[PDB]
């Protein structure tokens, strides 16, 4: 964690994020997502967990919109994978995708002792092969009501190419962190670690892409780092 | 307010914004709203923008993000509490179907005047019935005369923000079991975070405490589930548990 923008806020205070986690967040947090972040606010890259407020946002849409089958993509400690399991009916589904399992397993526990480890099919790989191997097997009725893509920053307009043909028409694709901290607001920024400003290259080029890619809609909320939610037209 | 009482003059709030920059905020708003914007939106928050209510607008990234949500739950049928010139009413009617209908209450049928020519020029006034009146006595005559068959997917609460709670009790009963109510500007341009807050006028200290009020009182609900998102002034999703 050698980077410069972990600490940034897109709010205007430590303060008002504070009031939003608890007053709105905390108290309607599972037991199990708790026990699962504070585990995880002792690793190096705590900085890269969904926070407490996105998290209820997530779980809001995936209910909303009855969604049945979803894939996450970047699980991380298992946070809003969780958030997600938690969300789905009894027999939901997620196919759940990351290059590092041992991450995985600092948040497994937590998973299991919410009773939801079973609707949950975890593959230790990049996420681009899989997208491609999916792609290759996909039959249309099983096409997922929705996507969480938070994995590999540099890589999403890849991801994004695969997604609106594995998603159906009318799901959902999230793209976590495409505010990146703010910094996304200015053509430079200094004093960013390289792989900072990859990432944030990357998503200058995503936020302009999406906003005028045919195939889908957008909404891009201002809640944790930035979220862009994208609904397949066709 | 912009439906009765202080004029806007008295207010102190007006000015600020919850996000930590105006460059972030612009760059949202030139980037991802106003590139999916409808340009009879345009043109009504444009004419909007001049009025002096201008404050209490539903600004462009928030629509957008009312918009999905209304796409995503597939609802049909709506309730706008709080319409002023028209905005988020405008953004519920083009995010609905063909055959989709809005019940819009506002006491002010002046303001959605303002907004109603870039409505038809939209082609969906069709699908809006308005009424002219305090808010409460019309949800409680839909209390009197609703049949579970016809309960409302969605309501986007935007009217007296000192009365949300009384909104919020009939609301619970006239959305469906599933189905979403909004709270618009639950965050109050951030001075929620604080028990005490310098310097407003009554009215907006009154709104302020009404909503730190609210937000402890959602939290707490069980009849809901919520989520409050720190877009555009807060928006605070509930959705019906039983
Ligand atoms: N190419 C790649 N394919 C799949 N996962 C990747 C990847 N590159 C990085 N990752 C993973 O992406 C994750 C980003 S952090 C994800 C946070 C998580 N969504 C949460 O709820 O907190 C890390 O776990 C990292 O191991
Ligand atoms: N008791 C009440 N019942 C119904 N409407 C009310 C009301 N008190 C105030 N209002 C109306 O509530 C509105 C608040 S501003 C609404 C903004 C609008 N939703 C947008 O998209 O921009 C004003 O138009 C005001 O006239
Ligand atoms: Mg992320
Ligand atoms: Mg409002």
């Avoid at 946070?79 to 009894?90: G, I, M, Q, R, V």
């Avoid at 009318?170 to 200015?186: E, K, M, P, Q, R």
Wanted: hydrophobic residues 40%.
């Amino acid at each position: 964690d050698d980077y410069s923008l972990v600490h940034k806020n897109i709010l205007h205070s430590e303060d008002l994020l504070k009031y939003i986690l608890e007053t709105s967040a905390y108290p309607r947090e599972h037991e199990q997502l708790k026990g699962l972040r504070e585990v995880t606010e002792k690793h190096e890259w705590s900085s890269a967990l969904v926070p407490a407020d996105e998290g209820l946002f997530l779980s809001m849409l995936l209910k909303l919109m009855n969604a049945k089958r979803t894939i996450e993509i970047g699980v991380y400690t298992g946070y809003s994978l969780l958030t997600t399991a938690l969300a789905l009916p009894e027999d939901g589904k997620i196919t759940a995708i990351d290059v590092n399992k041992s991450y995985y397993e600092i948040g497994l526990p937590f998973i299991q002792k919410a009773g939801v480890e079973h609707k949950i099919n975890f593959i230790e790989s990049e996420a681009l092969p899989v997208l491609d191997q999916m792609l290759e097997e996909m039959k249309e009725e099983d096409l997922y009501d929705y996507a969480f893509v938070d994995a590999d920053k540099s890589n999403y307009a890849n991801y994004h190419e695969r997604l609106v043909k594995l998603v159906r028409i009318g799901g959902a694709i999230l793209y976590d962190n495409t505010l990146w901290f703010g910094s996304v607001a200015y053509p430079e920024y200094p004093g960013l670690h390289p792989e900072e400003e990859v990432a944030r290259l990357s998503f200058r080029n995503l936020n302009t892409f999406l906003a005028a890619d045919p195939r889908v809609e957008i909404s891009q909320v201002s809640i944790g780092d930035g979220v862009t939610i994208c609904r397949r037209l066709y």
